[PDB]
Write a protein that binds this ligand. Structure first.
Ligand SMILES: Nc1nc(=O)c2ncn([C@@H]3O[C@@H]4COP(=O)(O)O[C@H]5[C@@H](O)[C@H](n6cnc7c(N)ncnc76)O[C@@H]5COP(=O)(O)O[C@@H]3[C@@H]4O)c2[nH]1
Ligand SMILES: Nc1nc(=O)c2ncn([C@@H]3O[C@@H]4COP(=O)(O)O[C@H]5[C@@H](O)[C@H](n6cnc7c(N)ncnc76)O[C@@H]5COP(=O)(O)O[C@@H]3[C@@H]4O)c2[nH]1
Ligand SMILES: COc1cc(C(=O)O)ccc1NCc1ccc(C2(C(C)(C)C)OCC(C)(C)CO2)cc1
Ligand SMILES: COc1cc(C(=O)O)ccc1NCc1ccc(C2(C(C)(C)C)OCC(C)(C)CO2)cc1
Lengths: 318, 318, 318, 318
């Protein structure tokens, strides 16, 4: 990571390595105990069969609910619903038949089935199937089930992809028709999502200069939609030090407000996590984005004293 | 849902009813088999103990990974990381002690622990911890782990919350200076996420008439950010039939773009699901929003034959 | 499929269904034979262990070669090379340890290892590991290891994506400055890849009318790269019937020529298969392409008599 | 490879040498264990028979799917489909008869057949037939199942084969009418697939000077298709140092675009590999091409610092 140390890096395969260590330790233990190795395989297969049967029971329980959404979620198809509730039906059926064959045959199946169903019903009714926070976060980042992902892609697709290509032209026009504004757009990324509408209320040194010429385009059925970029003066010890096109990242305002509305179901820990995820995703997008031909810089900072103007000037004087 | 029948309703408790029926059936089956309830209780407790030990081992394996993000994601606290990997540690410890006690007491513990660890390691290494699509969708909707949620809240907070209060004044100003446009902002919600940049290209009857009295204000370091809302005339049979403010929902354009980009990890089925989720979320927000004092009207439509102008005129007349 | 009946449809899951049927039949057979079920599991696990060991041996054999390409293919990393030769090392190691534990323990490991290595060496030296044509084709279509995929994406990205958006404008300009040319671009897709440079040499009825105004753009460091679309007159019984912008698909010329150069290693059966795959992929691309707002039609035909002008007029008169 | 060291050389026979060493080691081990060669031969033949039966069963399972494409992909011939699913049927039948004979004869066949079918069905249903990345890459390179192959052959056939013969005449015409440009077409092969639409944006020294005497001809129904090749001056230290015809390879732009689109199923590692494969294939083609009579020069470069103009001037001077 390079934006800010607080930004987490993508998760690796540490869990699989721990699993391999656990497997080795368990095999060594079973070897030490000196137990009939055929029993080990027998009972492991029985345990996996129990897991498969429990998955089947929970899947039918969830199907009881998902069938009410068949015509809206699954195109009125029962096969798609069954697949959503039990994975691939062919593999699940194959493993179910293997379980049945290797339980009835290896040294009652109906009693075991009743017990597994009782356990599954107890877990479902009491809500014991809740995923751990780490598992939920891993599932969300893996499949990009996050608001920050969509916000970053909206910021790139809706604003940056349509502004950065025509940013140098407007800057050169302003320079011709008027100071030495830095030839880039600097985006502030407050991880606290404290985005004021005025940069002068954050740091007095950051003062408002003139503005770039408006950019107009037809967007989503709105004729001549306006995009305006403001130019700000950076004051050091009361004297101007540098000029640049500065602006906060607006989606952080949405992240902050969502933590203020109870209807959003968005907590403050979620706010921080999604802000950092937004920063990471935006950096990843800009890395491979062809529009960003050195036309944008991301400035992520955290408030513990702190001077925003100093960070901007550090990123400018490099 | 009144927008479109294709919008799926929120999930209920069908899984709970199915679990209750399964519980009753399993109790009946155990009664029929004639075995005494004491053995059933013993083996049920043993199965739950095995589940608890498996959870412990999986949490240890996942902690082996989450400890790498202790400082960035967990604020340098080992308690928080362990909690994320094992839920509330106190409850987990209590249940583990219960499991150990009711194993050593109920007719070798270490061997079963090794077997369970072997099974968990096999599940982790072979990627058998996968959660079914229905489970993942339910976990996301309950926790609002979706891009559509953030996009809808950004659209409401970013644009509607600032435009709807001042829309009546702008429309009245436009009328006094010329115009019998309607007193609502009509929003198009294509479930296919088409969103062309010009309405007339989707339906020739939709023809641009004139703009509105531009609204401007400060927004996240941008001075005089301009908000534009255009007016379109609704042609019908070659002559005018209605006029109002009409514009697409840009977050759907963002969703469509995300499906085109591979860096987003966003599919087209996910695109449709997230578009419908966005529509439902925006519907739910405007219902309880103080700003939507009858000042907006959401229009959702799936392209089969059909005419956008006809849909808008139907929503106007009706 | 709709382009042409000869175009294959994507492969389904028939192999998995046949596998499930085979599994059921084998389980029924084993049950009928009345054999100790523990032996079945024992020998199945032994067979899978043998397969894992054979995979390990073949993987090290292939690593012996892939290590020579470590600095060019795998970024000078040995871990990446090992992963490319043996899949995920963690899972492979786990299954190897399971094999070792459940072979030495279930009723010589070194003799079996030597025999498996001998078999693997015999297969490698004699070239017995060759994949069947169906398996190769499935692997290629699954991962898009095909020339036709790249050719279709080049045709869309390089030509259509930069022509179709500005096609109606040029057609309207020609109509103003001059007949009733159809308002679309019609692309011929001869599955035999017999693409002549002159449409009049194929069918005399297809005659050359004037041409659309040139389209110019800077492409790949070439200033004002020219794109020219020709207009052709469709003669029926000696009299004009319709006008349209017609052109063959050029990548078919490359497909044909590649079958003429031995240096290409491209056969005629490969030519036909890749031509049909190109047609399918182009249709799939245009289906979801936003540029194709009814601006292009694909005309795939096969020569058994046949009149190209008749097919063009059939697609025009619809 | 002289283009760039990062271009991997074609694979050799290292796997064969490794297999030979493994064979020798296994023979030595079997000699050491002291078992007679007769048992070794028996069990080796049994193992090969098991492999043959597994191939038979997998081919039956895959035929259950390929029979759906008998008419579209196999020309309505069952023999061709069976051959694609089982290689040459005669050899497969001979080997199966040998297996049956040497099983019934060498100290229950149907039980082992059922076990092998169970194993094959498990492998198919669980998706265990996956081929390692090295194996897939070798199969693709041997069979030229790559997009880069088709792109390179299209670039040579489509553009170079038509431009190189007439490039000298055009350059001479340009010189007589004005100019000391070089007598070769220089092609840039960025392994990162950047390919900006204007050279000066990648290096300010690369400045457009003038075009050439446009070449035109008929191409796949396009009358007077125009081929343009621009001239760029190579600045060095503020004054001219060299002039020649310079243009990027557009197939690399196609590769980059394919990686941006999700519908392509094209990754970025695959992008780099296919770019290097394209460069190698184009190098191999021009070596034996009658058209490349010293009329072209390929320049490959990976962006580390480095200057494109410096690379071009180095290739010119040297
Ligand atoms: N600093 C800045 N100046 C701009 O001109 C601008 N325009 C867009 N954006 C930001 O890029 C992202 C993409 O916007 P998108 O249109 O896809 O969703 C937008 C869009 O659907 C709607 N909306 C906002 N402003 C307008 C507007 N002027 N006209 C029409 N719709 C608007 O409400 C959504 C949220 O906007 P913001 O959450 O305040 O910041 C946006 C957004 O984060 C801008 N950011
Ligand atoms: N009918 C038609 N008229 C055109 O103007 C045209 N321009 C491009 N194409 C086709 O689209 C596809 C994309 O071309 P790409 O540039 O990515 O690769 C091209 C490009 O790298 C190079 N090339 C061909 N023509 C030119 C040209 N005029 N200028 C520079 N490079 C060219 O050689 C490749 C193969 O071209 P064609 O294989 O004959 O047909 C192309 C191609 O199939 C055209 N097709
Ligand atoms: C990716 O493949 C898998 C997918 C899934 C899934 O879809 O959930 C689960 C497990 C998968 N592979 C591991 C595995 C498969 C099968 C068995 C087996 C034997 C065939 C050992 C005889 O043991 C008993 C059994 C009833 C569990 C099934 O058969 C053991 C282990
Ligand atoms: C995705 O899961 C798989 C991946 C791969 C692969 O990477 O090739 C192969 C197989 C995978 N699942 C199936 C599977 C079956 C059986 C076994 C097992 C028992 C766990 C029975 C005890 O028996 C046979 C063994 C000793 C060899 C290993 O252990 C394990 C797994």
């Amino acid at each position: 990571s390079s934006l800010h140390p607080s930004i987490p890096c993508p998760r690796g395969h540490g869990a699989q390595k721990a699993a391999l260590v656990l497997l080795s330790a368990c095999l060594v233990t079973l070897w030490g105990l000196g137990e009939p190795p055929e029993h080990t395989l027998r009972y492991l297969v029985l345990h996996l069969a129990s897991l498969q049967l429990g998955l089947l029971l929970n899947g039918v329980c969830s199907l009881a609910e998902e069938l009410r959404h068949i015509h809206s979620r699954y195109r009125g198809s029962y096969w798609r619903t069954v697949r959503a509730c039990l994975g691939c039906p062919l593999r699940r059926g194959a493993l179910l038949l293997l379980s049945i064959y290797f339980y009835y045959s290896l040294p009652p199946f109906t009693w075991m089935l009743a017990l597994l169903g009782l356990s599954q019903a107890l877990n479902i009714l009491l809500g014991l199937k809740g995923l751990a926070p780490a598992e939920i976060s891993a599932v969300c980042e893996k499949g990009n089930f996050n608001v920050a992902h969509g916000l970053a892609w909206s910021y790139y697709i809706g604003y940056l992809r349509l502004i950065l290509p025509e940013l140098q032209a407007r800057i050169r026009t302003y320079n011709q028709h008027y100071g030495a504004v830095s030839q880039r757009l600097y985006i502030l990324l407050p991880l606290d999502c404290g985005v004021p509408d005025n940069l002068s209320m954050a740091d007095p040194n950051i003062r408002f200069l003139d503005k770039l010429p408006q950019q107009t385009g037809d967007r989503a059925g709105i004729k001549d939609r306006v995009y305006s970029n403001s130019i700000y003066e950076l004051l050091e010890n009361g004297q101007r030090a540098g000029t640049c096109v500065l602006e906060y990242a607006t989606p952080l305002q949405t992240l902050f407000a969502m933590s203020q509305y109870s209807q959003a179901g968005f907590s403050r820990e979620d706010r921080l996590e999604q802000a950092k995820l937004f920063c990471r995703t935006l950096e990843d997008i800009l890395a491979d984005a062809p529009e960003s031909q050195n036309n944008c810089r991301l400035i992520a900072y955290q408030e513990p004293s702190f001077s925003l103007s100093q960070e901007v000037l550090r990123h400018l004087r490099q």
